[PDB]
Every structure is written in C-alpha cells, then in structure tokens.
Amino acid sequence: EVQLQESGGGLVYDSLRLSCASSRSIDGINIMRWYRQAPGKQRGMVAVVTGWGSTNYVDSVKGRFIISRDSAKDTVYLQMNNLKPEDTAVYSCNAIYRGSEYWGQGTQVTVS
Amino acid sequence: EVQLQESGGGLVYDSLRLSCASSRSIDGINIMRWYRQAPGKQRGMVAVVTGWGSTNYVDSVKGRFIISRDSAKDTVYLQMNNLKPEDTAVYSCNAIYRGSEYWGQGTQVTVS
Amino acid sequence: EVQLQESGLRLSCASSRSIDGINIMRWYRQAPGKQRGMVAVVTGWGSTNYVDSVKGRFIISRDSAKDTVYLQMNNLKPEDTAVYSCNAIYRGSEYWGQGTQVTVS
Amino acid sequence: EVQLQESGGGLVYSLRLSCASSRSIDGINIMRWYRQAPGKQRGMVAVVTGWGSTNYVDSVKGRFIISRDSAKDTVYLQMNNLKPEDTAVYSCNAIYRGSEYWGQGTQVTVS
Amino acid sequence: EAKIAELQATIERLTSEAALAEGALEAARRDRSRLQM
Amino acid sequence: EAKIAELQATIERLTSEAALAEGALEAARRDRSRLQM
DSSP: OOOEEOOOOOOOOOEEEEEEEESSSTTOOSEEEEEEEOSSSOEEEEEEEOSSSOOOBOGGGTTTEEEEOOTTTTEEEEEEESOOGGGOEEEEEEEEETTEEEEOOOOEEOOO | OOOOOOOOOOOOOOOEEEOOBOOSSTTOOSOEEEEEEOSSSOOOEEEEEOSSSOEEEOGGGTTTSEEEOOTTTTBOEEEEOSOOGGGOEEEOOEEEETTEEEEOOOEEEOOO | OOOOEEOOOEEEEEOSSOTTSSOOEEEEEEOTTSOOOEEEEEOTTOOEEEOTTTTTTOEEEEETTTTEEEEEOOSOOGGGOOEEEEEEOBTTBOOBOOOEEOOOO | OOOEEEEOOSOOOOOOOEEEEOSSTTOOSSEEEEEEOTTSOOOEEEEEOTTOOOBOOTTTTTTOOEEEETTTTEEEEOOOSOOGGGOSEEEEEEOSTTOOOOOOOOOOOOO | OHHHHHHHHHHHHHHHHHHHHHHHHHHHHHHHHHHHO | OHHHHHHHHHHHHHHHHHHHHHHHHHHHHHHHHHHHO
C-alpha cells in the first residue's frame, strides 16, 4: 500500500508550509486532498487537487490556502497563508488511488 | 386543617366552574389563587382573589375566566369561561393563612 | 444544453439526448421546510449507491435505450414524504429539471 | 411619588455596595432591589420591608445582605463574596399605594 | 385604618405583579420547552 | 484504457464518499435542527 510521509510544524506570532510525499505510484493518484482534524471533534477536508491541476477548496479557507501538486516529490503543496491561529488542527493528507483510499499520519501546526 | 376540595371534569367539545371548599379558618381570606398544571408542564398561579374583593388574573387567561369569592359557604369560585382545549390540565386551589402555604388535591379539567 | 423532464411507487426522467453519453446523474429529495438533499446515484457504469436514510429502501436502474433513468419507491414510511427532483451532471455543469412531489404513506 | 439614590462602584480585592431613599421614610412596605446585566431583561434581587423581612434572590444568599436604616431615609444592601458576574446596571425601589417606582442604578466589577 | 388600607394596596399590587410575572414568564418557559425539548 | 479505468474507479470512490457525507450530515440537520428549533 502507498505510504505517506508529511511535513510542517512550528510556532510563530501568517504563512507556513505542508506537503506530504507518497511512497509509491509517484503521480499515480487522481484525487488528493488534505483533511483538517481538530481535537475531539471529527475530521474534515480542507482542499483538493484533481489528477491534473484544478483545485476546489472548503469555503472556510478559500483564498487562504494554495494547494498544488509537485510530481518532483509527489508532494502536493498545501500552503498555509494568512493563518487565523484558531484554525489549528492535526492535518492528514488523503490519496484516492485505484478506487482505494489511503490515509496519512496527521500533522498539527499552530502559530501566534 | 384547612382542607380544599373542588369540582370539575368530564368530556366536552362551553363554560364550567371549579370550586375550593374551605374547611377551617373560614374567611382567613387572603390570597386564594388557583394553579394550572398541564402534564409534564409546570404549575402556575392563574387567578387570584385577595382577602377583600380585588381580583387579578394572569394574562394567560386575562379577561377570559371570572373569579368570585362567595363567603356564604366560603368557597371561592373560578368561572371557567368559554373553554378551549389547551386549558385541559389539573387544576387545584391555593390558600394563604398566617403566611402558611396550603394546597388542594387537584382536579382534572379536560375540554374539547 | 440538456433538458431533464420528470415523470412518475416508481418514478423516472428523460434527458434531452445522449444517455450514457451522459456521465454521472443522481436524484435529490426536497423535504418541505428543508434544504436540498441527494437520494441515489447511478453512473455511466451502472455503478450505484444510495444514501443511508434510503439505503435498502430505494432501487435505481438505467435504461440505455430510451434516454432515461429510474427510481422505484419501496416499502415507504411516510417520513420520506417530499418533493423530488432528478439531477444530472454534464461536462462540469448542473442539470436540474422541474421535479415532482411524493405524499404521505 | 418617591426618588431613589444609590452607591457602590469600582473593584476591590473588601467588597462594597448600597443604595438610599428619599421621601416619607418608613412607608417601607415592599422596598426592593433590582439588577440588570446589560442586554438582558430586568431583575429583582433582594426584598426588605418595614417589618424586618429578609428574603433574597436564589443567587445572593451568602453573596449579599439587606439593611434598613430608618434614621437617614435609607435602605442598605452590602455585597459579599466577590465574583464579577454581579456586574450590571442596578436599581433600588419601593412600593407605595402600589405605584410603580424606579430609579437609576449603579455598576459592579471584576478582580 | 390608613395603614391597613396601605397594606391592602401593597398586597394587591404584589399579587398583580406576581400574576403578570407568572403568566408572561411561564409563556417564556413554554417556548423553552417547545423549542429545545 | 488504463487511464479511463483508473479515473472511473476514482469516480465510484467519490460517489460513495459523497453519499456517506450527505447521509451523516442530513442526519445532523434533522437531529440538531430539531434540538434547536
């Protein structure tokens, strides 16, 4: 099964970066999307990338994030910008490959 | 001691009466108010006769019922007027003598 | 440019043209005093699924010939009483018809 | 026809409150306090009459006290047990021939 | 006589305000029950 | 043909996941909209 390693982290008093790389089938995933996982409460998607470049987002973060592929490391680029610090949450990135759904390990980030 | 018996009941689909039999301290008259307890719903003071003739009801039946104290047998009446369903509940009688609360046995009014 | 005229315990719609040249289409349920809600999904594959409320309840079927899709009401409890409208998706577009209603019991 | 005056602002780590009265003292039938947290309805807190009555609102037992100085035409209510929520706009009225009587009020604090 | 009349008035108004309060705010608790139970 | 098969499998995955979301969250509307209004 495709393994997924992620990135990100820190703590500052507006911008930060988060990209997860798949273990195999580089460029072998149609829909990829990160979900937000806030404490206690359940999990929910934040942004999507199709297999080819278009990017719908969640209304909660329109314009606030840029999501973009990078076949160089199979690291779709979930970019955190102008963060409202309350929006912190463990972040796991998903992969829908060959009809099967593969989950990341989750990552938590906060600033301010 | 100061006993309280009433009347009322029975099926209908216009106006009726309910009593409050006073047993002792006949004309210990002060606030003789009546209470309205719909099942599950909480009780509530409805219509009051003071010790001396003044009568305030509650807005919930304001101007609808008529209250009347007839010391001939010293049984304060409530003229249940132009009945409509929702009043269907237990009704009782209340008395205050020497600052001491008292309670009736409650009667089941059922209309419509 | 597609039109989805409705019909209809068994209800259907017809498309303007190109059934099975029409990719994903689904149906929606409008309970009164409520907002929109999806019902069941046929694909171009015939791959199919329902929503949890109507799971097991409703059954959906595609007729490739006469430009149509089918929903059949089943063992209905009045709670499903609503106005239904049949939907379709074509090269990234909505496609909604006029829809029709269902009653108590 | 009555008039109403009060006192008791600021924050202490002691604790203070009171009101006063104006006209024809010892007509002190139901002479009651009120309190209004801003953007809420009215509210009665403590009731004291001429006959040494003592009864309060379900929240100020322990938290408060009523006093009644017949001398200088006044009724007293002294806060106890600091806790900020008691911050509000106040009033301290009475009843006379059953006429609606009302005043201005005061505020309360934190810390 | 004057003081019994004035107490008469204070009782009549305490009952009147009690009736207004009980009616209005039992309607309020009725709304509470209907829209959250 | 491989590409169309892959993308179609993804279509079924999205359809099923979206159905699950719609169901759970219509249930959320029902339940807590009743507990609120």
